[PDB]
Amino acid sequence: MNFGSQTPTIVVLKEGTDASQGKGQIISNINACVAVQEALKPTLGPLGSDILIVTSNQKTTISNDGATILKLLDVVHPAAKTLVDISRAQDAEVGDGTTS
Amino acid sequence: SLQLLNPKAESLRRDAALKVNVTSAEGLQSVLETNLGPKGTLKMLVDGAGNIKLTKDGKVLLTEMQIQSPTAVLIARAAAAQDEITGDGTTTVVCLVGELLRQAHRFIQEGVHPRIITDGFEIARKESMKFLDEFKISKTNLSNDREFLLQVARSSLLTKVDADLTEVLTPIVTDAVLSVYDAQADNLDLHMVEIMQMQHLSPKDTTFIKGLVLDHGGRHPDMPTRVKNAYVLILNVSLEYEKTEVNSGFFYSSADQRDKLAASERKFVDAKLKKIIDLKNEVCGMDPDKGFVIINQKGIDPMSLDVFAKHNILALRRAKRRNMERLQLVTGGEAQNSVEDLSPQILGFSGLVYQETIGEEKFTYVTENTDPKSCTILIKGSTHYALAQTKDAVRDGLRAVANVLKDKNIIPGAGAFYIALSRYLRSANMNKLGAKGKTKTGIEAFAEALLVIPKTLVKNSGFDPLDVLAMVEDELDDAQDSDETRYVGVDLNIGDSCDPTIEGIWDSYRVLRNAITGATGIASNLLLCDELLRAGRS
Amino acid sequence: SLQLLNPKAESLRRDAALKVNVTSAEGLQSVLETNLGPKGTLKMLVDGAGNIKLTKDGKVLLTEMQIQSPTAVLIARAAAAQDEITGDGTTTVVCLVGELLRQAHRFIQEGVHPRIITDGFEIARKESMKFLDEFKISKTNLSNDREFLLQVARS
Amino acid sequence: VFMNASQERTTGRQAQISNITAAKAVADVIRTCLGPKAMLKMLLDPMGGLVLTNDGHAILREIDVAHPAAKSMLELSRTQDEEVGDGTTTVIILAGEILAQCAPYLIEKNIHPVIIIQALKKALTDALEVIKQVSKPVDVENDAAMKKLIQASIGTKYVIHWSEKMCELALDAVKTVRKDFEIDIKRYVRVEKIPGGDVLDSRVLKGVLLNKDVVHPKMSRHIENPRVVLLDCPLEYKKGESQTNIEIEKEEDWNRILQIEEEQVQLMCEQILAVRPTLVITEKGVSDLAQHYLLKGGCSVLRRVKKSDNNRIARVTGATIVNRVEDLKESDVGTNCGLFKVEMIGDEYFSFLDNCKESGLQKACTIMLRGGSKDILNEIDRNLQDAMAVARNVMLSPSLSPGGGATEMAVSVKLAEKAKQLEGIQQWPYQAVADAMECIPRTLIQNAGGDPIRLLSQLRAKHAQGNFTTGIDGDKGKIVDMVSYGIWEPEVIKQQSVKTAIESACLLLRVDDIVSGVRK
Amino acid sequence: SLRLPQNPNAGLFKQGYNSYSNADGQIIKSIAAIRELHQMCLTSMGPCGRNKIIVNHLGKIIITNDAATMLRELDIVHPAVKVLVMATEQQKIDMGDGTNLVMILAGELLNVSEKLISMGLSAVEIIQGYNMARKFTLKELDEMVVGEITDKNDKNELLKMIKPVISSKKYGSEDILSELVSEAVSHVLPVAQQAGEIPYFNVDSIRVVKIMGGSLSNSTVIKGMVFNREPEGHVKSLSEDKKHKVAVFTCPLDIANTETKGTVLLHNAQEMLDFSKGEEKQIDAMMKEIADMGVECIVAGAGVGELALHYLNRYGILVLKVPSKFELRRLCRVCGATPLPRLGAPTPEELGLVETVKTMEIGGDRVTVFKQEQGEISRTSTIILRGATQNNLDDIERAIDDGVAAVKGLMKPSGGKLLPGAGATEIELISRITKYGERTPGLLQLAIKQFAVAFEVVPRTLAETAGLDVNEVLPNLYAAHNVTDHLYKGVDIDGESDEGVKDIREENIYDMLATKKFAINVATEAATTVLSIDQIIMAKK
Amino acid sequence: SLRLPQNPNAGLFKQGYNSYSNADGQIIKSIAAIRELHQMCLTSMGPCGRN
Numbered sequence A: 001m002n003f004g005s006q007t008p009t010i011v012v013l014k015e016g017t018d019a020s021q022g023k024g025q026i027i028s029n030i031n032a033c034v035a036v037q038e039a040l041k042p043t044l045g046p047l048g049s050d051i052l053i054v055t056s057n058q059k060t061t062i063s064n065d066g067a068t069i070l071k072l073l074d075v076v077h078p079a080a081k082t083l084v085d086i087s088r089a090q091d092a093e094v095g096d097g098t099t100s
Numbered sequence B: 001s002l003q004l005l006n007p008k009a010e011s012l013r014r015d016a017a018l019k020v021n022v023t024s025a026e027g028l029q030s031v032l033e034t035n036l037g038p039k040g041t042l043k044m045l046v047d048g049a050g051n052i053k054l055t056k057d058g059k060v061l062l063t064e065m066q067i068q069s070p071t072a073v074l075i076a077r078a079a080a081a082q083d084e085i086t087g088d089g090t091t092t093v094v095c096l097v098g099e100l101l102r103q104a105h106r107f108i109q110e111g112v113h114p115r116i117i118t119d120g121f122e123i124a125r126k127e128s129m130k131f132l133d134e135f136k137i138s139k140t141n142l143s144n145d146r147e148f149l150l151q152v153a154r155s156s157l158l159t160k161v162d163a164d165l166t167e168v169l170t171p172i173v174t175d176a177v178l179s180v181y182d183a184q185a186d187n188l189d190l191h192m193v194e195i196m197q198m199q200h201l202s203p204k205d206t207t208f209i210k211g212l213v214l215d216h217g218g219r220h221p222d223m224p225t226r227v228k229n230a231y232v233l234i235l236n237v238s239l240e241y242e243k244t245e246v247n248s249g250f251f252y253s254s255a256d257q258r259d260k261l262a263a264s265e266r267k268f269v270d271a272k273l274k275k276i277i278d279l280k281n282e283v284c285g286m287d288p289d290k291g292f293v294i295i296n297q298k299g300i301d302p303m304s305l306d307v308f309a310k311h312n313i314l315a316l317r318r319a320k321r322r323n324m325e326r327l328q329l330v331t332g333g334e335a336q337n338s339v340e341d342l343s344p345q346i347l348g349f350s351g352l353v354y355q356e357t358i359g360e361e362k363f364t365y366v367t368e369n370t371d372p373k374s375c376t377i378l379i380k381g382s383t384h385y386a387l388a389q390t391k392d393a394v395r396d397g398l399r400a401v402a403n404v405l406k407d408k409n410i411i412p413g414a415g416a417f418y419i420a421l422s423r424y425l426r427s428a429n430m431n432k433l434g435a436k437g438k439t440k441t442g443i444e445a446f447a448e449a450l451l452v453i454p455k456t457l458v459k460n461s462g463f464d465p466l467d468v469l470a471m472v473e474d475e476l477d478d479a480q481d482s483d484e485t486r487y488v489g490v491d492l493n494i495g496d497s498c499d500p501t502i503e504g505i506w507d508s509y510r511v512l513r514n515a516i517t518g519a520t521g522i523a524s525n526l527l528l529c530d531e532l533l534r535a536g537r538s
Numbered sequence C: 001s002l003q004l005l006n007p008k009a010e011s012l013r014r015d016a017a018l019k020v021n022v023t024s025a026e027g028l029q030s031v032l033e034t035n036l037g038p039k040g041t042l043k044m045l046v047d048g049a050g051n052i053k054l055t056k057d058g059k060v061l062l063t064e065m066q067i068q069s070p071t072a073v074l075i076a077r078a079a080a081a082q083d084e085i086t087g088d089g090t091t092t093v094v095c096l097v098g099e100l101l102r103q104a105h106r107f108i109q110e111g112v113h114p115r116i117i118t119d120g121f122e123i124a125r126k127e128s129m130k131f132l133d134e135f136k137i138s139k140t141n142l143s144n145d146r147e148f149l150l151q152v153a154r155s
Numbered sequence D: 001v002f003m004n005a006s007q008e009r010t011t012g013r014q015a016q017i018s019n020i021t022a023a024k025a026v027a028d029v030i031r032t033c034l035g036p037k038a039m040l041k042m043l044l045d046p047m048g049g050l051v052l053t054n055d056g057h058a059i060l061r062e063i064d065v066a067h068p069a070a071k072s073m074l075e076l077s078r079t080q081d082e083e084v085g086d087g088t089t090t091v092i093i094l095a096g097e098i099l100a101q102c103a104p105y106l107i108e109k110n111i112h113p114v115i116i117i118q119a120l121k122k123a124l125t126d127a128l129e130v131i132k133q134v135s136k137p138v139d140v141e142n143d144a145a146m147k148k149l150i151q152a153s154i155g156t157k158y159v160i161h162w163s164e165k166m167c168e169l170a171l172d173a174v175k176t177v178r179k180d181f182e183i184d185i186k187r188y189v190r191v192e193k194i195p196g197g198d199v200l201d202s203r204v205l206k207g208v209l210l211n212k213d214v215v216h217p218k219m220s221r222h223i224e225n226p227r228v229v230l231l232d233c234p235l236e237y238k239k240g241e242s243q244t245n246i247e248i249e250k251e252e253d254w255n256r257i258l259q260i261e262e263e264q265v266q267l268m269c270e271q272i273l274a275v276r277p278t279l280v281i282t283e284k285g286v287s288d289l290a291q292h293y294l295l296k297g298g299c300s301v302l303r304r305v306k307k308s309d310n311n312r313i314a315r316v317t318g319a320t321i322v323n324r325v326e327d328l329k330e331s332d333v334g335t336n337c338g339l340f341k342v343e344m345i346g347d348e349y350f351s352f353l354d355n356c357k358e359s360g361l362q363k364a365c366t367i368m369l370r371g372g373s374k375d376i377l378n379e380i381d382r383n384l385q386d387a388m389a390v391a392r393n394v395m396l397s398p399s400l401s402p403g404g405g406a407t408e409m410a411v412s413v414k415l416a417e418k419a420k421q422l423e424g425i426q427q428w429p430y431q432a433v434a435d436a437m438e439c440i441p442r443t444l445i446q447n448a449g450g451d452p453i454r455l456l457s458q459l460r461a462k463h464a465q466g467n468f469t470t471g472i473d474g475d476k477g478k479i480v481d482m483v484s485y486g487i488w489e490p491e492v493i494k495q496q497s498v499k500t501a502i503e504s505a506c507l508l509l510r511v512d513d514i515v516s517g518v519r520k
Numbered sequence E: 001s002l003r004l005p006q007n008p009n010a011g012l013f014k015q016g017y018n019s020y021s022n023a024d025g026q027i028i029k030s031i032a033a034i035r036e037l038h039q040m041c042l043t044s045m046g047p048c049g050r051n052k053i054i055v056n057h058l059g060k061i062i063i064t065n066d067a068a069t070m071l072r073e074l075d076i077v078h079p080a081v082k083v084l085v086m087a088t089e090q091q092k093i094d095m096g097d098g099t100n101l102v103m104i105l106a107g108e109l110l111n112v113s114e115k116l117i118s119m120g121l122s123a124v125e126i127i128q129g130y131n132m133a134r135k136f137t138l139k140e141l142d143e144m145v146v147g148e149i150t151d152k153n154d155k156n157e158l159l160k161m162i163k164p165v166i167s168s169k170k171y172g173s174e175d176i177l178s179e180l181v182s183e184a185v186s187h188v189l190p191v192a193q194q195a196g197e198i199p200y201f202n203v204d205s206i207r208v209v210k211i212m213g214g215s216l217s218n219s220t221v222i223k224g225m226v227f228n229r230e231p232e233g234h235v236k237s238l239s240e241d242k243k244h245k246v247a248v249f250t251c252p253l254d255i256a257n258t259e260t261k262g263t264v265l266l267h268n269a270q271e272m273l274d275f276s277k278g279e280e281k282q283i284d285a286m287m288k289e290i291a292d293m294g295v296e297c298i299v300a301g302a303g304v305g306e307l308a309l310h311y312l313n314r315y316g317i318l319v320l321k322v323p324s325k326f327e328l329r330r331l332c333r334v335c336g337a338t339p340l341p342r343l344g345a346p347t348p349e350e351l352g353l354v355e356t357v358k359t360m361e362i363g364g365d366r367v368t369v370f371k372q373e374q375g376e377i378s379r380t381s382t383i384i385l386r387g388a389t390q391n392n393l394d395d396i397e398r399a400i401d402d403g404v405a406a407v408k409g410l411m412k413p414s415g416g417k418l419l420p421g422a423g424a425t426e427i428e429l430i431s432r433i434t435k436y437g438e439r440t441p442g443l444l445q446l447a448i449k450q451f452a453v454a455f456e457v458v459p460r461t462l463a464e465t466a467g468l469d470v471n472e473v474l475p476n477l478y479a480a481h482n483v484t485d486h487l488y489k490g491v492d493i494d495g496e497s498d499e500g501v502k503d504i505r506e507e508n509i510y511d512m513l514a515t516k517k518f519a520i521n522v523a524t525e526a527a528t529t530v531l532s533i534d535q536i537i538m539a540k541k
Numbered sequence F: 001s002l003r004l005p006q007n008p009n010a011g012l013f014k015q016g017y018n019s020y021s022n023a024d025g026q027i028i029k030s031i032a033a034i035r036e037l038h039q040m041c042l043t044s045m046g047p048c049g050r051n
């Protein structure tokens, strides 16, 4: 009746699709934003420090505001892209307070 | 259910497990189908080593070719276990389980349960056991009919070898079996009858020797070759050196004391040789006419062989365990181990002892006994496979004829047993039986499966198997009304029925009994199994 | 003998070719017979592209699923010619061929030649036509009644 | 990186979902291996053998699952086999259902895995009460009822056709091992096998059965009254615990050293002949020089016998384990031996020792099996362990519970009725215990081809009104009371099934996460 | 006893084909495997549901707590799941409402039917059971209606319609987004004393223009549309003309060239001198006629040449490309003009009216605003969304698409009557079906009871997302229905939800009749297919 | 059609084992196999035989 020797079970999601349940993922998403937050922590204020970024194409780009710093760093994580979207939205609407 | 548990596994269930047991059964049946019968085909088996061994026995085919299927290994143990104790009926077990599965599988496809089908085989098997009591015939052993034993010996030997080997090897078995029967009526096959290999002129020159033959002879030239009257002596004591449990150095001090202590090696050996000389002094009369021979189970030192050579005493060393258990039966003497207590009563008797050598090996022949209680069958052969073919033929022939003397009954063969059970199971009233429900086809399945064996004999001859049973069926229809009890047969020479009572075709009693019992158990267990799987740590 | 002509060739002759023809027919029968009747089961032809399709006709099941065995290709081609001219009864063709080879092979194992076996099928086939033309019944379709067409369509 | 973990942590609800699915998968393998119409199972081990059986324990021994939750379910069969010896498949099939029924709630109604445990102990406490009430006592000395009690388990096996012989075979064997409380043990039950022969002529014979023959040919093959004496040391010359290292100086020393080797074996043989035994069974090997002078007195010498068989010979013949030969007396010599005889079988020789049959030490015996092949012997041998296991429970406990699922169905009805009066938070897991207890009957019905729907509906309608002994006939598939059906099982197997199944669920339900690949 | 015989039907179908039939255990394998994705739609259900981030293979990230948008991007290998996938898509394209109910019910019917198959009830009888239970469910929902609406014009009446739909997706924003959608529908519908005979409505009427930046409260309604495009030529007057006639040309403003390719042929230099002025006078004859009637705005779909743009700059005519063809016709609906691929001349009947056009930046980018006051509009509106992230505005668009899709679901049929929501009518159906199962004796009664148990997930899923105990508020809610007042009992979601009773009319939570009927039918048909199949045949990759 | 079933029920024995029946002219091949080395013996019998 069967076509062959054995029949391996189907994975519901595609092979290699990452997924997780519980409170661990939302903590990882929050910790991902805090990891991006720590880069812009000492930049805030008049006595703050600039950030030097060098992308894969080897073009130097120094900046103080968080609008173009986040544009240079191509963000993979969706939760960390939330800070990048509001920074460009704040840069597009007002133009101040992108780090705060 | 098994794939999420085990990451790697194989599983067949509810249709493939049934097809596997039937397909593997039909596959293994086709291998041994052509070998069954007298006109069957031979089968050689050559491994990577290059040796050759030729025989028609299904056990040799199964226990030499490695097999991977899980069904056939149970048929291999079943065919082997039935033959290992009985010595006959190997392919018959494979054909029954090979045919009973396919004959029941057609009704499993119809939708009948396997449980009630196997219930029909068991209650049908009990009817065959009741039929064996009425079908067998009593035979009294007090008559000592040698012609009856000759016909039984030709039943198995004609199947394995041709008529040229059967006619010359048949009375070799009959003379060996004629001495088995005695007043005690205790059968003894392994100790009494033996087989020994010897590359010689041809297979046709096999002869019977009433005494025990040995595969060794006299080492020294001056020791006598032929002895007329040789009184044997059994001694299991080892007459070479012994290392002596931790005993160490013969600490010698001076040079003269060195060889003085080396001479003590002979004193332990000479202490035992003197007892043999004291025994020879009692039987010293007629020393040129008579003789003396010593047979040891362990090795003899070459220093002591010159002692026996001077007194013209024949020496034989390193005998088997079985030969020491046979010298008392042949020569009539008694066994001895220690050299302290000797007597002339334990010495045997022999009428002729001579040696013949070929190439490097040398054989010692003993025969012309007064009242030999045992004997041997020295088989001659050309090639190694010729000895292996004669090994299986003599091994299966002695066990088949020996079982006739165990009981007081014998079963005629040539399909008479299977054809008789066919009419019995198909004509018996079912109300007498306790089986009801869907046991209608189980009686017909097992009754019809027995018919395939006697036509497999016809399939090797090339005739039409269905047409040569027409007159067989017509004979039994008139035989019951004619008031004449006769048993038909299947003669493959002319393609017509025959009578095994006058032709001499016979079969043992426990072969067909154990065959159906072993086959019904294996075939029933394979039918009830509905799932196959492999799992374990490796 | 065939290896001397072409070493890369193979051949099964007179016992292995018969088991292949019968086992392939019984294997095709055991899979495809379940769709016969109203209580039959539904098959999901899921190809590599993810296309899902429900059906019970043996024509479209064998068309999408390529056949590896050489015997079942001949049976699938018979179902194609059946579905082409008629459009119904493909499951009866594979069951009849599977059962005819099963019932015939039961007698080939008993030592009967295949020639006279097939001769009996043709005489039995011609005998069925002489039974079929008497078994049929004639009706008048000029009335164009709706009740007969509904129950015939419902079947 | 961090420690050897965190590959893929299955946490939260999905971890328990895999365990219920994994625990259910173990029962699905042997779902058809229950009831009188149960199917067999051939498992392929990787070494090269084969195991043909339907017992759930023997099936789960050979299988190997790479999952930690399913392995705890695997060990429950060893709990049942090494406690009673019957109902191993009943243990595995019931637990699966208990874990499965409790699952709906765990997955959806969010009852925490501890509240289910508290609900099950009260169900366990009530299960023993109704199982105690539903069971009826039975007389232990009634051989007519004992044969029908022993063959209840044989009916679910291949040898139901030979049930008339197996009950007589098992009953005689159990009474032999039974000591006059009534403690018995299967270590002396010899499982020696003989390939081939018919089952009808197979019979139990009082005594032992060796695989070896006598050494010397002149030994008596037929003795009327054997007198067995067990020896532990070998008859060879003992080298000693320390090296001898004899410094030989004179020529008359080496022949003396080889002569005392002959006299020491004479001294130990001559003191054995003070009592004049007929059969001397040595544990270790024997020498060629010593056997002759034991034959001069009339003894019989054998090869090395493993002491597992000598301990059986000590209880059969009444002899004691003796190593020091100088302290050999007449009181410790075995006696009252029935008969000695050696049969010829092509496999190997076989020496028979029969007993005179006429408190003291418990007597041993050897059960002869004459099967069709090797697998038939191993199949029948496990049936005797399953059949003889039933005979122990009736002696240790005179209670007798009804079979055919009537006992477990009685648990289902009372737990279902009492669940309404148990109003609270424990009501939902307490009511789910009855849903699994009515499945054993369901499994039996499903293997008969019956329909579980109307039969179980007809069962519950007649169980409250008709009687407490109602059940399903596995062969016919109709409702037949166990009183007229005449098949009964012990109550001890029902206790271990309910206890082991519920106690297994309490362990596995507490599993939160699964982390694989830590260390060895 | 080492290697198996390898299933001698291996001469049949290739190794890539996998059979997973029944008896082997297909139903047990399937109903279970899909419990993982059943919890996905269950957790994303209700007003407190959790949105799920789905990153496709291209990298376009989306975050939507529905079911149709999620399962479209999920590449699912399991075939039995895919029956539920496109069955949910049918709800999206047809009604645009009820994706999640469909998933939590079609899957729950398979989950709750574990008891029927495990007990040993026939699969054919289960299909007949749910079909007859489906018919009783459709007939019974008509009697529990108390929201028979006949006006369906005013804005306050839509508060019982749009706000329950918007309250599900992002519950925090109710009054703001409902004002945008309700004000959009009022601009879409025409001003009339009695508009009947099934007036036409389509989902393409209300469009969504996403602008980056700005709080959600600062949004506003625009009667026209807003394009991210650069005007050319001049600045507008913005109050001087008071109204502007807008011509929309399909073909570009250039000299009429043929489809077949040609070139310039000049036999002498006299034509060379006049060719420079001939092209200028050719367009001037066609461009001067357009300016006579006062067409103050021209829209050409294809690329406009520089020669045509130069003549229009001096007269002060607005130009616009609008390359896409779908959005070109929506501008015609605003002004009320027809497309004209011919140049011809402007006629008064075919030319529309537009009040004003003004250009500014809303989120930093310059855009063109076609807002008009006191003008006549017909089936056109837009909602300018202001948000912090593009990922959040994508969910607001689909929430508005589901909101206006419900308006299509109301006005297209003769009646889109309301029902009690918030776990009110679902528990009522459990009581109706429980009483219906006892009326018909037979073996199918077990299927009727288990069909009612599948409706239990709707109340408790709101309680599970609310952080409440299911075993307290759910059985307490049954005591409230004992006995109008008993029909308006529902599930409360608040810190004071220990009582478990909240009146529906205080906040006016309601659901549609046609949405639940189509959801129950597609859910039953989805479960009918999964329970009817027995064999599933795969293939390689 | 692209590939045969390659002799089903061949797992009864090992892959290395092969059968050679009298049919298919194999007994003629065994006579031809004798004929290979038999012709070597033709040049080696007699007084004019070649080593």
Ligand SMILES: Nc1ncnc2c1ncn2[C@@H]1O[C@H](COP(=O)(O)OP(=O)(O)O)[C@@H](O)[C@H]1O
Pocket (backbone or CB within 6 Å): A043, A044, A045, A046, A064, A065, A095, A096, A097, A098, A099, A100
């Ligand atoms: N002269 C000042 N005195 C006190 N605080 C200041 C002064 N100038 C800037 N700040 C503070 O520094 C913070 C960061 O400003 P800055 O980083 O320069 O702007 P942005 O973050 O927009 O780039 C602001 O929050 C502001 O309150």
Ligand SMILES: Nc1ncnc2c1ncn2[C@@H]1O[C@H](COP(=O)(O)OP(=O)(O)O)[C@@H](O)[C@H]1O
Pocket (backbone or CB within 6 Å): B036, B037, B038, B088, B089, B090, B091, B092, B093, B155, B156, B158, B159, B413, B414, B415, B490, B491, B492, B505, B506, B507
């Ligand atoms: N010359 C013969 N004529 C008729 N029947 C024969 C002859 N030789 C053998 N048979 C039949 O062949 C069967 C098988 O014989 P045998 O080779 O001894 O057993 P197995 O084939 O099982 O090893 C027997 O039942 C016997 O009756």
Ligand SMILES: Nc1ncnc2c1ncn2[C@@H]1O[C@H](COP(=O)(O)OP(=O)(O)O)[C@@H](O)[C@H]1O
Pocket (backbone or CB within 6 Å): C035, C036, C037, C038, C056, C057, C088, C089, C090, C091, C092, C155
């Ligand atoms: N309702 C029914 N009851 C009994 N037999 C039926 C019924 N419907 C069809 N059959 C039988 O099934 C056979 C095949 O019919 P059908 O399934 O329509 O064709 P196919 O098997 O090619 O799909 C017919 O010969 C008919 O006898």
Ligand SMILES: Nc1ncnc2c1ncn2[C@@H]1O[C@H](COP(=O)(O)OP(=O)(O)O)[C@@H](O)[C@H]1O
Pocket (backbone or CB within 6 Å): D034, D035, D036, D055, D056, D086, D087, D088, D089, D090, D152, D153, D154, D155, D156, D403, D404, D405, D406, D444, D472, D473, D474, D475, D487
């Ligand atoms: N003849 C029978 N009819 C109905 N049920 C039976 C019958 N025999 C055994 N059973 C049921 O099968 C269960 C297991 O019995 P058995 O097969 O002896 O043990 P095991 O499961 O260890 O093989 C018992 O609980 C009993 O209720």
Ligand SMILES: Nc1ncnc2c1ncn2[C@@H]1O[C@H](COP(=O)(O)OP(=O)(O)O)[C@@H](O)[C@H]1O
Pocket (backbone or CB within 6 Å): E045, E046, E047, E097, E098, E099, E100, E101, E102, E164, E167, E168, E169, E421, E422, E423, E490, E491, E492, E493, E507, E509, E510, E511, E515
């Ligand atoms: N404030 C509230 N109080 C009570 N119930 C609410 C509230 N807001 C939303 N709900 C309920 O949440 C449910 C969400 O349903 P939803 O899945 O969005 O509907 P659909 O499946 O038709 O899209 C609605 O049925 C509604 O009754």
Ligand SMILES: [Mg+2]
Pocket (backbone or CB within 6 Å): A096, A097
């Ligand atoms: Mg700043």
Ligand SMILES: [Mg+2]
Pocket (backbone or CB within 6 Å): B088, B089, B156, B159, B396
């Ligand atoms: Mg034979």
Ligand SMILES: [Mg+2]
Pocket (backbone or CB within 6 Å): C088, C089
């Ligand atoms: Mg049809």
Ligand SMILES: [Mg+2]
Pocket (backbone or CB within 6 Å): D086, D087, D153, D156, D386
């Ligand atoms: Mg049991």
Ligand SMILES: [Mg+2]
Pocket (backbone or CB within 6 Å): E097, E098, E165, E168, E402
């Ligand atoms: Mg909604």
